[PDB]
Amino acid sequence: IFVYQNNITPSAMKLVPSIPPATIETFNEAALVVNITHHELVPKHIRLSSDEKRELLKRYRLKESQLPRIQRADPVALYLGLKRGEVVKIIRKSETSGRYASYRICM
Amino acid sequence: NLPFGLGYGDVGKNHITEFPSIPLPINGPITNKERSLAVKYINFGKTVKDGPFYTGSMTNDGIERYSDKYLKKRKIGISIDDHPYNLNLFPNELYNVMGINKKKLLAISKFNNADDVFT
Amino acid sequence: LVTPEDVMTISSLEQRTLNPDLFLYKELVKAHLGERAASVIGMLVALGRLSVRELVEKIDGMDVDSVKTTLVSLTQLRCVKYLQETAISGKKTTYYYYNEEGIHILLYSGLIIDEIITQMRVNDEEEHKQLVAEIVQNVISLGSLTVEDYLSSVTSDSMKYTISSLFVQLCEMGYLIQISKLHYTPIEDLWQFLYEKHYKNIPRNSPLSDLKKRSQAKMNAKTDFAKIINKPNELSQILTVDPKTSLRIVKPTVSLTINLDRFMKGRRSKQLINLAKTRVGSVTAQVYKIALRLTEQKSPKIRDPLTQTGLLQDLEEAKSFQDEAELVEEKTPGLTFNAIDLARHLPAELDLRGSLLSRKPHSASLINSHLKILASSNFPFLNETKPGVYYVPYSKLMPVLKSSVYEYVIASTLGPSAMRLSRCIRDNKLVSEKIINSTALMKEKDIRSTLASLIRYNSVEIQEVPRTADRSASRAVFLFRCKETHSYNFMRQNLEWNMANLLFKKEKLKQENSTLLKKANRDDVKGRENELLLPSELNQLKMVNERELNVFARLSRLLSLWEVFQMA
Amino acid sequence: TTNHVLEVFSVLGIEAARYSIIREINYTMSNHGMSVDPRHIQLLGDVMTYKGEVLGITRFGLSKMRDSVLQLASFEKTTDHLFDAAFYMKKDAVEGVS
Amino acid sequence: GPWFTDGELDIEFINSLLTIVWRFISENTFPNGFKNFENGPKKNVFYAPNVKNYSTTQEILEFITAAQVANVELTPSNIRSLCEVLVYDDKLEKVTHDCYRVTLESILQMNFSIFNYFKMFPASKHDKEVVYFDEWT
DNA sequence: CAGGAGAAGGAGCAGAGCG
DNA sequence: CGCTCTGCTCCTTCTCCTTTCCTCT
RNA sequence: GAGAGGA
C-alpha cells in the first residue's frame, strides 16, 4: 500500500498494475483522514471467501454474473481491497425493515 | 443537372451488367505440359482422399442374414491412429486419440505417370 | 432479362461475399481433407487462435474426439500451427493457429512435383524419375515421413539403395528439410518468446537506458532468431557418413518434410527467367536461367528474413532490414559468381558462338559479355560487385518484377490505354487531367473513361484538393496518384478469390456428376471406359475430365500469376 | 452529508449512494405531505445502483442497464440503437415485457 | 500545341508518328532490323553490350526532318515529349542522357508467361469455369 | 422556439526520457 | 540540458429529448 | 395539413 502525499504522476499509475504475483495500491493522504467505513451512510461490508461465495451461489442458485456487482475502485471496495470476483456481504440497516443482507461482487 | 458529356438518350434505365465481361488471358486451350501438371494435381488429392487423414464425413440392418455372411469385407480401413507419428511434434492433449500404442502401418502413395483422363 | 431467382443461381453471387483468404483456405481443405477439417479451418481463419474447447463450442459437430481427430489430421499434414503456452495463474492451455505454408503446399502440389522432376537431372535417365516422383508425392501427401518406413515398404535391395540415394540427393538439394517443433510455432510468437530470456535476464541495475536496453534486447534476440530459423537448413542430419561402405546416407530416425521456402525460391527464379525472356535473347535467357539455378540454393528466402512478420517494423529503422538483407544479398558466398562457373556448367547444346554481334563453344569472354548486357539494362537482372563479377540483386528486382506483372495484367484485362495511363500516373506523381492529356497525348474522353474504369480497383487513387470551406465537388480539384501497395494487395486478393472460385466450381462439378465417377472405380474398371459403359456415360465422363483438366490448368496459370504478388 | 447523490457516491462508495438516494427521495416526498411507501423508494434506489454505479433514468442511464435492443429503441433513440445493434450484431433474447 | 486538331488532340497523326518513330528506334537498336525476326526468336542476334545501340532525341529529330512525314516543323522538346509518351506501353526503353532503345517486348508483340499475353486465345463460348478479372468486384 | 447532456476534436501544458 | 513526443485535462462546439389524447374544421 | 375549444 503506497500512501502518496499530494499527487501521482500518470506514468506511475501506468506502472502500478504490472506485477503478476503481487499488487500495489495508491491512497491519497487527503483521501485517508476519516475512514469511509465509519461514516453513517456506509453499511457494514464483509469479505466472503471462496467457500462462502460458493455456498451463497448454491443457496440462491445464481452465477457470478448475476449478483449486483460493485465496481472496483469503489471507495468502500478499494478500502477492503477486494479483487475481481470476490463477493462482499452488506449488512444494510433500514428503519422500516431492521437489518438485512445484500450481496455484491467486485468487477 | 445533366453533365456536359451526357445526353438524355443514354440515361433513364439503370442496367448494371451483374455478369463479368473482362476475362483474364489464362483461359486458353491447355498444353501437354499443363495436361501433365493437372494429372499430378488430380492424382494428388485423389491419394489424400484415399489417404488415412480424411475424416471427411460431417441396408445396415441389424437382422442377421446368411446372404451377408460369406461375403468379404470391403477393404482394410486404415484409421488416423494407425499411422506412425512423431510424438515430439504434436501437442500432448491429442495423444489420447492417436495410435500411441498400436501396430505400425504406413501406406505408400504410388504415383502413376500415365494419365487417367479418358482419351 | 434475368430474374434474381436465376441470378442467385448462375452468377456466382453467393460466394462473391466470402473473404478470399477464408474462401480459398476452406475450399482447399474441403477438397483435400474433408468437411470436418474444412469447418475447423474455417473457424480458425474466422476467429483465430482457438483452443479445443472453443473449437468444440463454435462448431455444431462438437464431438471432442472428432475435433481432436481433425486437429491431428491437420497437424500431421501441418495445416495448423499450434502453440503450447503456460498460464501462470493455473492450468496451461494450448492454442491452435492456421498454417498458411501447409495450405500453400496443398495448393502447389502439382507445381511442386513438376519442379522436383524438372530441376533434378533425372528425367533424362527415365528410370528413377518415377521413383523421385513417388517420393515427393508421398512426402507431400502424408506430411512427414521417416526413411525407414518408406524403405521397409519396399523389398528390393536395389530399390532400397536407389530410394536412399534419391533421399540423400533431394535433401542435399534443399527441397527436403528436417521438421521440428519450430515448424509448428508461429513466427510472431517465436519472436515474442525470444524477446524475453534476453530482456528479462538483464540485471535490475541501471541498464544502459530503457530504449537502449530494448535495443540491446532486440540485437541479442535477432541473432538467435536467425540461428534457430536457419537451424533446419544446416544439413546436420545427412552427415551420417560411414555406417558401412563409407557412403553419404541420411539418418534413419530424422523425419523429413518438403521445404516450401526452397520451392518458392525456385518459383521466383522461374518468374525472373520469364521476365528476362522479354528483355534479352533466348541464349541470354538460358544463361540467366542457369545462373539462377546455380545460385538458387544460396539465395535469400522469398518472403522475408522472418523478422518482418515477427514484430513492428521499427520507428524508422525498418530500412535496416533492407540494408541487412542487402548485405547478405551481396555477401553470401554462393551468390557471387563469374563467367567461369557458368561456362563450366553450361550445357553443350547451346551454340553461344554467333549470338552476340561485336559492332554495327562456352567461351568465357562471350558469357561475360552476355552477363554485362544483362547488367546493362535498366531492369536490375544482374549487378556488378567486382570488375567481371556479377550477382543477381533480389532486393532491387522484386519491385520492378511486381510492377511489370501488375502493368501487364492491367494491359491484358483492360485496354492497352489502361496500361499507358497507369504507367503515366506511376512515373508522374499527383497529375491533373490537363497534365495527363499533355504528357499522354490521347483523347481526354478516353482518358476519363479509362480513369473511371481503373478507379474501380485500387489502381488510381483520387486526391481531393478543396477550394472552398466545404469539400463538395464542382469547386474542388481532383489529382491522381497510384499507391502501388493498394494495387498489389487488391490484385492479390482478387487472384486469391478467382482461384477459390475455380476450386469451388471444380468441386461442385465433381459432386454433381459423382455417380459415373464412382462407377469408374466401383469395379476397378478404369482403362475400360469404352468397353463397359454406355456411350452417354462415355461422353459425360469425357466432359467432366476435360473440365477438371481445364480447371487445374487455369489454377496453375493463376498460381504463376499471383506468386509474384505473394513475394516480398 | 450533502444533497448531491453523485458526490456521496464518489466519496463514500456506492452503498452510501443508494442510502442517499432513498433518503433524499423519502424526504422530498414527505416534506410534500404525500404518502408513498418507502419500499417503492428502496426498489428505485436498488434499480439505480445495482449495476455497480449510479445510473440515471435518462436515455443514457438506461442504455447501460437494459441489453434488449428493441426495448431501448422503443423508449428513446430508436434508429441509433437499431443501427448499433445491427453493426455490433447484438443477439438479444426477448424476455422483457416490451 | 501543333498536335491539336479542331481544338482537340487527334490520335491518327499521333499514332502514325509514334509508329514511325518506334520503327526507326527499333531499326537503330537492332543488328539488321525486322528481318532478324522473320525466322523467329531461335536465331536472332543482338548488339554487344559495349556498343551504342540507343538513339538520342536528336537522331529522331533528324529522321523526322529528312522523312518529311510529320509535314510540320517539330521542335526537339515536342519530339522528346512524344517519345516519352511512347516510353509507356513498354516501348522505347529510356537510357540516361535522353537516349532511347526499343524494348524487346515491343517487337515480340508485333506478331504461363503472362508477359506475352497476346499469344493466348480467348475462352470458348458457353464455357464454364472461365476466369474473369472483375468477377469479384 | 428554449433547456439539458452527452461525444468529438483543438489546444495548452506536465512528464518522461534522451544524446 | 533544452528538445521532442505522449498523455492528460480543459475548453469549445457540436446532438437528442419536452403526457394523455379527443374531437372538429 | 395546421386553428381552436375540451377533460
Swiss-Prot record, chain A:
Subcellular location: Nucleus
Taxonomic superkingdom: Eukaryota
Family designation: Belongs to the archaeal Rpo5/eukaryotic RPB5 RNA polymerase subunit family.
Function: DNA-dependent RNA polymerases catalyze the transcription of DNA into RNA using the four ribonucleoside triphosphates as substrates. Common component of RNA polymerases I, II and III which synthesize ribosomal RNA precursors, mRNA precursors and many functional non-coding RNAs, and small RNAs, such as 5S rRNA and tRNAs, respectively. Pol II is the central component of the basal RNA polymerase II transcription machinery. RNA polymerase complexes are composed of mobile elements that move relative to each other.
Oligomeric and partner information: Component of the RNA polymerase I (Pol I), RNA polymerase II (Pol II) and RNA polymerase III (Pol III) complexes. Component of the RNA polymerase I (Pol I) complex consisting of 14 subunits: RPA135, RPA190, RPC40, RPA14, RPB5, RPO26, RPA43, RPB8, RPA12, RPB10, RPC19, RPC10, RPA49 and RPA34. The complex is composed of a horseshoe-shaped core containing ten subunits (RPA135, RPA190, RPB5, RPO26, RPB8, RPB10, RPC10, RPA12, RPC19 and RPC40) where RPA135 and RPA190 form the DNA-binding cleft.
UniProt protein name: DNA-directed RNA polymerases I, II, and III subunit RPABC1
Species per Swiss-Prot/TrEMBL record: Saccharomyces cerevisiae (strain ATCC 204508 / S288c)
Residue span relative to the full protein: 109 to 215 of 215
From Swiss-Prot, chain B:
Subcellular location: Nucleus
GO CC, one annotated term: nucleoplasm
Main location: nucleus
Keywords, in A-Z order: DNA-binding, DNA-directed RNA polymerase, Nucleotidyltransferase, Nucleus, Phosphoprotein, Transcription, Transferase
Highest taxon of source: Eukaryota
An individual GO BP term: transcription by RNA polymerase III
GO molecular function, one term: nucleotidyltransferase activity
Other information: The acidic domain is essential for its function.
Subunit structure: Component of the RNA polymerase III (Pol III) complex consisting of 17 subunits.
Purpose of the protein: DNA-dependent RNA polymerase catalyzes the transcription of DNA into RNA using the four ribonucleoside triphosphates as substrates. Specific peripheric component of RNA polymerase III which synthesizes small RNAs, such as 5S rRNA and tRNAs. C31 is involved in the formation of the initiation complex.
Entry similarity comment: Belongs to the eukaryotic RPC7 RNA polymerase subunit family.
Protein name: DNA-directed RNA polymerase III subunit RPC7
Organism from which the protein derives: Saccharomyces cerevisiae (strain ATCC 204508 / S288c)
Top-level taxonomy: Eukaryota, Fungi, Dikarya, Ascomycota, Saccharomycotina
Full protein stretch here: 18 to 161 of 251
UniProtKB/Swiss-Prot annotation, chain D:
Domain of life of the organism encoding this protein: Eukaryota
Location of the protein in the cell: Nucleus
Similarity comment: Belongs to the RNA polymerase beta' chain family.
Note in the entry: Present with 6020 molecules/cell in log phase SD medium.
Subunit composition and interactions: Component of the RNA polymerase III (Pol III) complex consisting of 17 subunits.
Cited function: DNA-dependent RNA polymerase catalyzes the transcription of DNA into RNA using the four ribonucleoside triphosphates as substrates. Largest and catalytic core component of RNA polymerase III which synthesizes small RNAs, such as 5S rRNA and tRNAs. Forms the polymerase active center together with the second largest subunit. A single-stranded DNA template strand of the promoter is positioned within the central active site cleft of Pol III.
Protein name: DNA-directed RNA polymerase III subunit RPC1
Lineage: Eukaryota, Fungi, Dikarya, Ascomycota, Saccharomycotina
Gene name as annotated: RPO31
Curated annotation (Swiss-Prot), chain E:
Natural source organism: Saccharomyces cerevisiae (strain ATCC 204508 / S288c)
Function recorded in the entry: DNA-dependent RNA polymerase catalyzes the transcription of DNA into RNA using the four ribonucleoside triphosphates as substrates. Specific peripheric component of RNA polymerase III which synthesizes small RNAs, such as 5S rRNA and tRNAs. Involved in recruitment of Pol III to the preinitiation complex. Involved in the configuration of an initiation-competent form of RNA polymerase.
Protein name: DNA-directed RNA polymerase III subunit RPC6
UniProt KW Transcription regulation keyword: no
Subcellular location: Nucleus
Effect upon mutating residue 10 to H: Cold-sensitive. Abolishes interaction with BRF1/TDS4
Residues of the full protein shown: 162 to 316 of 317
GO biological process: termination of RNA polymerase III transcription; transcription by RNA polymerase III; transcription initiation at RNA polymerase III promoter; tRNA transcription by RNA polymerase III
Principal place of residence: nucleus
Keyword list, A-Z: DNA-directed RNA polymerase, Nucleus, Transcription
GO annotation, cellular component aspect: cytoplasm; mitochondrion; nucleoplasm; nucleus; RNA polymerase III complex
